[PDB]
Homo-oligomer: A and B are copies of this chain.
Amino acid sequence: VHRILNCRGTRIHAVADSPPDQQGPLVVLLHGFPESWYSWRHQIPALAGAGYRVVAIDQRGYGRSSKYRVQKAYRIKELVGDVVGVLDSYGAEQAFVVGHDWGAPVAWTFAWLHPDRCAGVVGISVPFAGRGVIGLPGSPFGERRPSDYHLELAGPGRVWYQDYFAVQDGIITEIEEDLRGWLLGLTYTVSGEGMMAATKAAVSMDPIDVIRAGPLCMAEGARLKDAFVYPETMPAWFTEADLDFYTGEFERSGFGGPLSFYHNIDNDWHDLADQQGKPLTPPALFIGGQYDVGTIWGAQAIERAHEVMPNYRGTHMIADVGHWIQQEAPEETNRLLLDFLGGLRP
């Protein structure tokens, strides 16, 4: 189950599963922020049962994988290089790569830069955004600079959460005061039930300005934790045992490495200029969430999927669920993945 891979000097921890014959196409699962290989707990058994060799890693800076302090260790191409190291560890020429949240940009970019090593790519929550890394209502494919675009058009005297994350000072401070409660807050808030309830509190305008006056949008000097919402009772899809797992991983790893991902966005947008225009050629698929903020912000990037991905095999919207897509709708997600992989050849 547990494996330690050496990806050209970087220790990458992973949880594997496959048919007893130890044969089948390789499927790599990339988790996002602030998650773990554990986020794919409902897919691993399904994919392995369908005949695939499934590998769910802890990205660098997470769980039991290498923890770097320097910022350059968390640039998109380093993340991508880790995925390449995974395939190399399994001696696999190609592999299906599935990424969620931050895992998606890495999976998308992995397919963009290494189409020869990719049999298919699936981004969950966050649609392909080219050099944009993360598509937003204003810039679906990174038309403008990430940082500055955040500043203006995102809040008068407010702060874009991503830029807050990138600071890695106050964000960490508000987390450590009570890490377990922070995880619960951030989870329930951008979840389905949490979003439906936040909307139910209607008491409809332009989406581009809905971000402001939103949770991920805070007033300068405040704390992102200030806008969280906690459930009266632990949702059925995210129990106490799940929260205890995640809590245990992060009280050991911290958020330093994870937050450096956000800190390098501008740097990623930079590193990916020499790719704009070039299409993403592997067969691609996007799974979005009705109430997921990732799906909503990349709405413009999704309408133009075929414009950037010739082998785009389609968009799939899961209703009533929020950001934690593969956990909130484990079986719907499994069906979609099994269909996509099923109709493709390794």
Q: Which residues of A contact B (CB under 8 A)?
A: 6, 9-11, 13, 63-70, 168-169, 172-173, 176-179, 248-249, 251-257, 259
Please tell me which one of the listed residues B9, B64, B251 contacts residue A251 in the complex, with CB atoms under 8 A apart: B64
Q: List, in ascending order, chain B residues with CB within 8 A of A68's CB.
A: 172-173, 176, 254, 256
Q: Nearest B residue to A168 by beta-carbon distance?
A: B69
Interface pairs (15), CB distance under 8 Å: A6-B178, A9-B177, A10-B176, A11-B176, A11-B179, A64-B248, A64-B252, A66-B176, A66-B254, A67-B254, A67-B255, A68-B176, A69-B256, A252-B252, A253-B254
The distance in angstroms between the C-alpha atoms of A122 and B70, with both chains bound, is 36
Please tell me which one of the listed residues B6, B9, B253, B256 contacts residue A252 in the complex, with CB atoms under 8 A apart: B253
By the criterion CB–CB under 8 Å, are A169 and B70 in contact? yes
Identify the 5 closest CB pairs spanning chains A and B, nearest first: A67-B254, A252-B252, A69-B256, A66-B176, A9-B177
Q: List, in ascending order, chain B residues with CB within 8 A of A249's CB.
A: 252
- Since A67-B254, A69-B69 are in contact, a sample of 7 more A-B pairs with Cβ atoms closer than 8 Å, ordered by chain A residue number, is A63-B252, A66-B176, A66-B254, A67-B176, A69-B168, A70-B172, A254-B257
The distance in angstroms between the C-alpha atoms of A251 and B61, with both chains bound, is 10
The distance in angstroms between the C-alpha atoms of A22 and B69, with both chains bound, is 41
Please tell me which one of the listed residues B67, B168, B169 contacts residue A253 in the complex, with CB atoms under 8 A apart: B67
Q: List, in ascending order, chain B residues with CB within 8 A of A177's CB.
A: 6, 9
Shortest CB-to-CB span from A227 to chain B, Å, is: 20
Q: List, in ascending order, chain B residues with CB within 8 A of A251's CB.
A: 11, 13, 64-66
Shortest CB-to-CB span from A183 to chain B, Å, is: 13
The distance in angstroms between the C-alpha atoms of A10 and B179, with both chains bound, is 10
Q: List, in ascending order, chain B residues with CB within 8 A of A70's CB.
A: 168-169, 172
Q: Nearest B residue to A67 by beta-carbon distance?
A: B254
Q: List, in ascending order, chain B residues with CB within 8 A of A11's CB.
A: 176, 179, 251
The distance in angstroms between the C-alpha atoms of A65 and B168, with both chains bound, is 17
The distance in angstroms between the C-alpha atoms of A253 and B248, with both chains bound, is 11
Q: List, in ascending order, chain B residues with CB within 8 A of A168's CB.
A: 69-70
Shortest CB-to-CB span from A16 to chain B, Å, is: 17
Q: List, in ascending order, chain B residues with CB within 8 A of A10's CB.
A: 176
The distance in angstroms between the C-alpha atoms of A172 and B11, with both chains bound, is 12
Q: List, in ascending order, chain B residues with CB within 8 A of A259's CB.
A: 69
Q: List, in ascending order, chain B residues with CB within 8 A of A9's CB.
A: 173, 176-177
